Amino acid sequence: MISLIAALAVDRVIGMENAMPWNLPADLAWFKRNTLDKPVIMGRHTWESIGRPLPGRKNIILSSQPGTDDRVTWVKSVDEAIAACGDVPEIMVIGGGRVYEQFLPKAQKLYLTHIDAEVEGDTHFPDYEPDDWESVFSEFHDADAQNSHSYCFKILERR
Amino acid sequence: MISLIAALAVDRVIGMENAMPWNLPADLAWFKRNTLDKPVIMGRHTWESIGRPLPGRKNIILSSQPGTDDRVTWVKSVDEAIAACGDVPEIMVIGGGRVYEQFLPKAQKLYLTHIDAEVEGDTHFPDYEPDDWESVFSEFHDADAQNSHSYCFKILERR
Ligand SMILES: CN(Cc1cnc2nc(N)nc(N)c2n1)c1ccc(C(=O)N[C@@H](CCC(=O)O)C(=O)O)cc1
Ligand SMILES: CN(Cc1cnc2nc(N)nc(N)c2n1)c1ccc(C(=O)N[C@@H](CCC(=O)O)C(=O)O)cc1
Ligand SMILES: [Ca+2]
Ligand SMILES: [Cl-]
Ligand SMILES: [Cl-]
């Protein structure tokens, strides 16, 4: 199954020119708890920002341009991309926008982090039909000694 | 010699309790490199925000209350705090506000990271009359993929 996992600011902003202006170690811990021992499919921009292969997950970069790290697989198409990961129960799309638009249609579940942060964006999370999705998990939290904005984690399943 | 190390947003705005609205691994690398192998003094809020002893550093918490962890030294006064090290070449004060305010008059060096982030706050780094300080090192940096904003590194010596 294909799942999408994203941190969204107010208005569905998922990326900037630069790093987002939030420090959410809890958002990372949720990110990891849900991506571990799973194949993660990302684009190049995001790969350039993670800094390295993610530990304990099969890194897959979806891109028309190639062959830079030895430590991740390099796929050129979604179709290929899907296979490169395999016969797995669930594949994780970790963005950015472009990969998001393309995997959506196939998406059966969404893992979202709603961050209360107003940012002028560059990329956005495609527009999903809130009618098409069902919320099966929700959990709100306030900013604290380590998290700079309040956030809410949610899981949607395609209706 | 006592030094203060602070990251400040526009208007000398510093953190009060919740994490600051930014992601600057460059600022943390600078912090490390400048504090490693030295004693660091801080308040109860900063400690909670760090949340573990800084490695390679002698951790001193200047609170007025109850020593909660044995892996750290718990003073109660400026006096107690200094002594607590004896004779080292440099003592670093890593904040918050109140600590800045009580060590400034004994401080002869400042390592400041100036961040182009308009952020809102009650607290501010204490006011230092530049006729008592010399800009000795300065170096700007553009925001990037790993760092949300622009920052300027700066060391000033008390004259
Ligand atoms: C820039 N970024 C891409 C990124 C960031 N946050 C997101 N957060 C959510 N919810 N979802 C996204 N898809 C996600 N993507 C990163 C940056 C670092 C980490 C990483 O360093 N995470 C550690 C866990 C956290 C820490 O231990 O360093 C990892 O094991 O996954 C992953 C993605
Ligand atoms: C929230 N907090 C207070 C803190 C944050 N940055 C500041 N930045 C400056 N320049 N100075 C301050 N006094 C300051 N102190 C922290 C947070 C984490 C780290 C800690 O994780 N530092 C690692 C180095 C950084 C990388 O380890 O993640 C350490 O070894 O210093 C310390 C400071
Ligand atoms: Ca429901
Ligand atoms: Cl990307
Ligand atoms: Cl403090």
UniProtKB/Swiss-Prot annotation, chains A, B:
Positions contributing to NADP(+) binding: 7, 13-19, 45-46, 63-64, 76, 95-102
GO MF annotation terms: dihydrofolate reductase activity; NADP binding
Catalytic activity, EC: 1.5.1.3
InterPro entries the UniProt entry points to: DHFR (IPR012259), DHFR-like_dom_sf (IPR024072), DHFR_CS (IPR017925), DHFR_dom (IPR001796)
Gene3D superfamilies: Dihydrofolate Reductase, subunit A
DHFR domain sequence ranges: 1-158
Catalytic activity: (6S)-5,6,7,8-tetrahydrofolate + NADP(+) = 7,8-dihydrofolate + NADPH + H(+)
Protein name listed in UniProt: Dihydrofolate reductase
Species for this entry: Escherichia coli O6:H1 (strain CFT073 / ATCC 700928 / UPEC)
